[PDB]
Design a protein around this ligand. Structure first.
Ligand SMILES: Nc1ncnc2c1ncn2[C@@H]1O[C@H](COP(=O)(O)OP(=O)(O)OP(=O)(O)O)[C@@H](O)[C@H]1O
Ligand SMILES: [Mg+2]
Lengths: 246, 233, 335, 94, 212, 198, 134, 99
DNA sequence: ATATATATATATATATATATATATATATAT
DNA sequence: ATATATATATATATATATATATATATATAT
């Protein structure tokens, strides 16, 4: 079988990036540049596109990886510019379907460095349409402008064959992505989402993540309900015996 | 009921041991520093095997502990685990939580990561006794095995026609040398794993695609300029 | 995947324990015979006719028959529940004894079925493991293993149900007693029940409502409404990606040095880094010297070790050129 | 005895899962999932998934196709098992 | 002596009010929640210090009352310091039906676990379908849209009763429930074998039930 | 056991009414002489008693007491509408200094209605009544009725003391400062209040 | 006792003039790896200087304590940052021991090439040294 | 520099601030059986050549523990290197470390 | 039909108590 | 005159309980 692939990553109105699309590689994509180039920003934007759960997203420095820094800030807000921003993934499914998943990010006005995230998906987009252009409107002389979610919905609905969906919960977002062969595990419960984010977070910083090795049992071995049922049966028996004894 | 419990735990443990032992042969002697191979050690814990035996055959002998109004079932299990096998010397953790932990079958197996460091055989992998590159390689091996296991488990729910996408990251790749990066590349391609790596210097000039980013201050704001790179010219 | 198969198909529209014992005995005989035949061994045709035709069909059919008996018992449990439920409607206080008997007989029957099931489950499992052991006598016996893996679960599955049903029934039973201890104890004559029924039927002839405490909820201050940032950001769109190429000069230099140095390994000549570096650096301009030295060392240290390094005598910093370049290395002797 | 295409497909899926089920027990928590999957495959939405699933399970129970047992601990607080008529109808094709 | 609890409060009442269970129980009670035998801890707590709590709550002009069935609750007086409210007539229908199901042996196979659909079926079986529907909408004549409206109303009333402790949703399922003995209060007008019109006056006088 | 002074405070005959009004969210200011003095005296123990409920007994800088529910509050919580906070800020503004010459501490529903109409933006008013409305009689009547309802809701909280009669004319208490903004050195209270409201 | 200490009366913060923006409080989460590493080294040299200043009055007037710092996994830094760090250490007469897995080749100072091998069934680190380049 | 067993924790560069996870401090496995030495040589502002150092020994026992003994040497000639003091150049191929 | 309020669960960081192992000075056997 | 055992202090890090913030389901009301 032909495994699906991540074609490209698009960044809109990000810190440093206005509208930039990196075409990913079949095997390895490398990013270089002096300190502060913005590679970590690209990684963060990708992972935000993958797991938009705001509770999990925490972009600590590679130094103090997992060491509590008490900054009170997850670091995502400072990585976005004012206004609308987008982070999208084009994926070729094993069914050879081009699906553009993505999220609209937006800073929340106020002293708190808080952000709002709204996921979305597009199916059936023609292979000739690039997300960078799809998400921007050419206004002025070579001066494209970004358009909000409502405008994007209007633009896409006017097209033929493209199906756009907007999710009210990251749960359905993950469910749809899993349905299209994008995620290995079905993140039905919040614990599954936490484990998934733990895996990608350990990968990003690389190496032996303390939490992983500490819960390797939970991460590898599957949960069994028969043992739980048997223990509950024994619990009920013991409770009845105690009732009788008392 | 206690006998039936112990039996089902034993069967589940045996099945999981067999599955993991079969999976172990999915590794092909990765070369990272002095680490020559990575392996998963699964073993039923004798401290817990004794507990299973007591539950399955000698439940009544310790009823005095079970039927105490002071102890809940989790606390009763914890106290019983304390009674027999008293040399483990658990820490300051409370009886309630340790009992609750005892109620999960997975706990009964020691599940550890072994590495064939140099010529010392297979040794337990402790971050405190491994170089940075060795630990990074071992962690990547663990993560790839975990994602493989997740894919395998979901093979039933998913349709027969879809293979989920595979992708991982590695920031500050400069911590790895050429040999380690070549080994990582060969592993990822053998496992059809996509990788996104970062390093200040182009550490992988002759494989995959590469980009270089330069940040320019420009009219009191910033812009990132991206340039593709090619192996030869 | 079977959903599409069904869609295109377009289709639409004995509880006696003596039985269970006799099927178990028949199964025991056939399973033991098949296990012994497998253990004795034979050619591919013998293996087939002894472990695939006789075993497969017979064991599948009779395990299905045993499961069918369990299903018939399930039907009987359902029927006895319904009979108890109907009886309690007609006699109320006078059906208590009838229901207790029916519960007693059903419980006894379930226990006897469980006993008969466990009377042969262990030995059948042993025989099946024996067949597993003997299966490996040929390479084409793969299918046999499937049965030796399949016929396991069914058996155990059967036994599981034999207990699970009781686990369920012994539960349900209690409820019935509770009902008798709770529903009918305070309604011995049932008059309260009829009177409640008539009240329900004729409630609105005297509509009345109960009173309940409805303490006020602690009104709280609404958190400030969250307003996002909107600025209609605009900017130049990136051009087409340019490209740059990597210089392989260092690769050429490394190849040159490796060829120049392989002679030392070939002849096992003692290599002295000082003299070699001093000679070789003369061929390049000063600014490149460093980028040479490093590479040369990288090439030299792969060739054997230096025995003096175990002597405890530090080596000196030999100069390898003008302008003040120095090197510290013992002679490389043990190749 | 009246099995439309959707009901028949749900019954066949139930039989397949029971065949591949470890200990031969089916909680309704999985029956509802199976009905959701079959209805999704058949691409028809007369009502919500839950109401259709409940109606079909009740119809099969009263049509002598499934047997229900009340167990609170079970996922969905109920355990369902194929009845002899259901077994016969399922294996007639399988 | 001074600095001595007996000066202000009896020792047992103070001990009860300082117990870890007091706050949740008090908040639930003031919210209108009935307490049955199922909440073993809370029921035992009420039983042990039952008298102290009736006298404490008397300060609010509300009676902590234990019905003969064994379930405690609060009945506010006309001079209640805690507001008071009355269940809807549909709530009475569902509560009477719930009591019937508690006492009904036909549904014994359910083992106490019931679904809203079965409750609605029983309700329509015993009540007047269209004339009961009249309250759901004044212009109903059997329209299936209004039928679904009545089903939804029954579901909502069932949820409110769940809030009152008359019914418990299952640890994982909100579509199935188990009845509690508190439902017996819905039959307080018929627990005594006398004329209905005198018992109604007795109850309303006692504050048990206001009219509509 | 129990703290002795806590037992004394709970036993006091004032405790039932005050407890009911607190659990109802009412704010106890300096006007309620007996209740305010009781809370002043026994705060050190009522704070613990109401912290047992995962609620905080807060004495505002103005002085008035109230209960703030935490996320784990044991007292059924509720949230004021948007119109409720808007009206609260309007009254906080009206707790003004020229107010003394304007209404001498006694306002009428008409004052609040006119201030709300003139001061608030049209979009929020429509959001209050309904989006599709645009300057109509029925919509304005419904808005006035909702204004009266929220005024009653505030009265329940002790924010507004009605002058005793069916007619709508009341007085504003100091506790209304809860809706108010923080005061900085030299800031005009009017300006900061209006900036918050806008 | 906390009030009894004068230091507690002081608020201390670390600020960086990041790019076009003014001075911002140094938050580990709002910086890249190299920026954080460099700021850490800066604060470390600040601490060393402060300690020397404090201790001078209790030492011989002609004693200058040695100053020496480390930097492991230096490859996380670019050439520009490494050059700036070298300039800083030189200006402060401060010795550095920096580890880099062959990625970077600092031309100034001493360099030590290490290679691990098996000799006589024992692990041995062959070591070579260079210096003076530049 | 700092011969204190309480503070010495050679955790991996990764997990630079994370909890121990294990109980070992990572020092014992970096030593070899026998007597080992770690020494610095320093030239003061006064130009006194001082050899500070510590003798390390893997404490034989159930756990992986290390014994450290500090020491200082003053007045050494500038022509003698630390490796010479601590090692005997016996006739064998490899020197011998002396206690 | 959908905006909105409400209850519940989980992850995450803070703060405090406590057991463990090591370092230092003194006491006492060798 | 010495080295080991004791008592003291300290940092480490282990665990618990608390409090916060976010996501979810879902039940109400226009
Ligand atoms: N949340 C933020 N707030 C402010 N500035 C930020 C934020 N995130 C990143 N930056 C700045 O953006 C620039 C790029 O940061 P980023 O971490 O993405 O770079 P990088 O390429 O990964 O760097 P390095 O390889 O040195 O780690 C740096 O100036 C960083 O300081
Ligand atoms: Mg970075």
């Amino acid at each position: 079988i032909e495994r699906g692939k991540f074609r490209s990553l698009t960044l809109v109105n990000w810190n440093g990036f206005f509208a930039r699309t990196f075409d990913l590689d079949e095997l390895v994509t490398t990013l270089s540049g002096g300190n502060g180039a913005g590679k970590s920003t690209t990684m963060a934007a990708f992972v935000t596109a993958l797991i938009p759960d705001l509770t999990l997203l925490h972009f600590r420095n590679t130094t103090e990886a997992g060491a509590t820094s008490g900054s009170r800030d997850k670091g995502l807000h400072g990585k976005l510019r004012a206004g609308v921003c987008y982070s999208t993934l084009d994926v070729i499914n094993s069914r050879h379907q081009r699906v553009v998943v993505g999220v609209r990010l937006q800073q929340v006005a106020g002293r708190d460095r808080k952000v709002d995230i709204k996921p979305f998906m597009i199916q059936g987009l023609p292979t000739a349409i690039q997300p960078t252009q799809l998400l921007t409107e050419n206004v002025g002389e070579r001066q494209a402008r970004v358009l909000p979610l409502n405008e994007l919905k209007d633009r896409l609905d006017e097209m033929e064959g493209v199906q756009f969906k907007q999710f009210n919960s990251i749960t359905d977002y993950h469910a749809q992505m899993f349905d299209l062969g994008v995620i290995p595990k079905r993140l039905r419960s919040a614990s599954d989402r936490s484990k998934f984010y733990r895996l990608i977070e350990a990968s990003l910083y690389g190496g032996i993540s303390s939490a992983i090795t500490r819960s390797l049992r939970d991460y590898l071995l599957p949960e069994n309900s028969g043992v739980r049922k048997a223990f509950q049966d024994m619990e009920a028996a013991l409770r009845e015996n105690r009732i009788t004894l008392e | 009921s206690s006998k039936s419990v112990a039996n089902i735990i034993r069967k589940t443990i045996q099945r999981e041991q067999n599955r993991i032992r079969m999976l172990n042969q999915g590794l092909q002697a990765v070369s990272f520093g002095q680490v020559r191979g990575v392996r998963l050690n699964v073993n039923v814990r004798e401290s817990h095997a004794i507990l299973l035996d007591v539950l399955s055959e000698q439940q009544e002998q310790h009823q005095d502990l079970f039927n105490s109004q002071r102890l809940t079932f989790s606390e009763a299990m914890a106290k019983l685990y304390q009674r027999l096998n008293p040399q483990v010397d658990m820490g300051q953790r409370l009886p309630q939580t340790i009992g609750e932990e005892l109620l999960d079958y997975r706990n009964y197996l020691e599940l550890d990561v072994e590495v064939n460091r140099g010529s010392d055989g297979w040794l337990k992998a402790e971050s405190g006794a491994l170089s940075t590159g060795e630990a990074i390689g071992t962690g990547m091996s663990i993560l790839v095995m975990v994602v493989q296991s997740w894919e395998e488990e979901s093979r039933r729910l998913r349709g027969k026609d879809i293979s989920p996408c595979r992708l991982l990251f590695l920031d500050q790749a400069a911590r790895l040398d050429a040999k380690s990066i070549a080994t990582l590349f060969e592993l990822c391609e053998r496992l059809q794993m996509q990788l996104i790596i970062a390093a200040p210097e182009n550490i992988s000039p002759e494989k995959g695609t590469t980009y270089k980013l330069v940040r320019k201050v420009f009219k009191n704001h910033e812009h990132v300029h991206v340039v593709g790179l090619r192996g030869f010219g | 995947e079977l959903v599409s198969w069904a869609r295109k198909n377009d289709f639409s529209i004995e509880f006696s324990t003596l039985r269970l014992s006799m099927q178990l005995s028949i199964v025991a005989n056939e399973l033991h015979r098949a296990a012994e035949a497998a253990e004795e061994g034979g050619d591919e045709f013998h293996w087939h006719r002894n472990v695939f035709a006789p075993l497969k069909y017979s064991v599948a059919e009779i395990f299905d028959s045993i499961d069918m008996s369990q299903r018939l018992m399930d039907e009987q449990q359902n029927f006895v529940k319904e009979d108890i439920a109907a009886l309690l409607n007609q006699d109320w206080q006078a059906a208590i004894a009838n229901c207790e008997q029916l519960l007693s007989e059903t419980s006894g029957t379930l226990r006897e079925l469980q006993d008969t099931l466990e009377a042969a489950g262990d030995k059948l499992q042993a025989n099946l493991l024996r067949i597993q052991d003997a299966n490996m006598g040929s390479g084409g016996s793969e299918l046999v293993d499937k049965l030796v893996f399949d016929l396991q679960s069914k058996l155990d599955r059967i036994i599981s149900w034999g207990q699970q049903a009781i686990d369920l029934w012994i539960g349900y039973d209690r409820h019935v007693h509770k009902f008798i201890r709770t529903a009918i104890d305070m309604d011995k004559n049932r008059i309260f029940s009829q009177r409640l029924r008539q009240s329900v039927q004729h409630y609105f002839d005297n509509p009345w409502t109960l009173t309940v405490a409805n303490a006020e909820r602690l009104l709280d201050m609404r958190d400030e409404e969250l307003a996002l940032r909107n600025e209609e950001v605009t900017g130049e769109l990136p051009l087409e990606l340019e490209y740059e190429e990597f210089s392989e000069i260092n690769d050429q230099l490394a190849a040159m040095i490796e060829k120049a140095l392989l002679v030392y390994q070939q002849e096992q000549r003692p290599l002295d880094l000082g003299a070699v570096l001093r000679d070789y650096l003369a061929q390049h301009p000063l600014p490149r010297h460093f980028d040479v030295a490093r590479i040369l060392v990288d090439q030299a240290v792969r060739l054997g070790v230096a025995e003096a390094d175990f002597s405890g005598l530090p080596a000196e910093w030999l100069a390898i050129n003008d302008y003040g370049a120095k090197v510290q290395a013992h002679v490389i002797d043990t190749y | 005895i009246s099995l439309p295409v959707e009901r028949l497909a749900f019954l066949m899926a139930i039989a397949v899962l029971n065949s591949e089920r470890l200990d031969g027990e089916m909680s309704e928590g999985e029956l509802i999932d199976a009905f959701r999957e079959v209805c999704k495959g058949f691409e028809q939405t007369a009502e919500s998934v839950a109401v259709r699933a409940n109606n079909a399970i009740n119809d099969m129970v009263r049509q002598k196709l499934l047997n229900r047992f009340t167990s609170e601990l079970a996922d969905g607080n109920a355990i369902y098992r194929l009845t002899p008529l259901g077994i016969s109808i399922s294996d007639y094709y399988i | 002596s001074s600095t001595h609890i007996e000066q202000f409060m009896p020792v047992k009442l103070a001990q009860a009010l300082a117990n870890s269970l007091f706050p949740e129980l008090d908040s639930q009670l003031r919210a209108g929640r009935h307490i049955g035998i199922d909440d073993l801890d809370n029921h035992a707590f009420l039983m042990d210090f039952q008298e102290q709590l009736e006298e404490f709550y008397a300060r609010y002009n509300v009676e902590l009352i234990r019905a003969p069935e064994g379930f405690f609750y609060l009945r506010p007086r006309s001079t209640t310091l805690i507001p008071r409210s009355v269940l809807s007539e549909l709530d009475m229908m569902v509560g009477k039906i719930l009591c019937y199901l508690y006492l009904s042996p036909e549904r014994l196979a359910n083992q106490g676990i019931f679904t809203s659909q079965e409750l609605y079926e029983e309700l329509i079986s015993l009540a007047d379908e269209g004339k009961l529907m009249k309250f759901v909408n004044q212009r109903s004549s059997g329209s299936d849209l209004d039928k679904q409206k009545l089903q939804e109303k029954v579901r909502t009333t069932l949820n409110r009763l769940r809030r009152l402790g008359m019914v418990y949703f299952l640890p994982n399922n909100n579509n199935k429930f188990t009845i509690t003995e508190a439902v017996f209060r819905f039959g307080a007008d018929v627990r005594s074998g006398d004329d209905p019109r005198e018992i109604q006056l007795r109850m309303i006088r006692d504050g048990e039930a206001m009219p509509v």
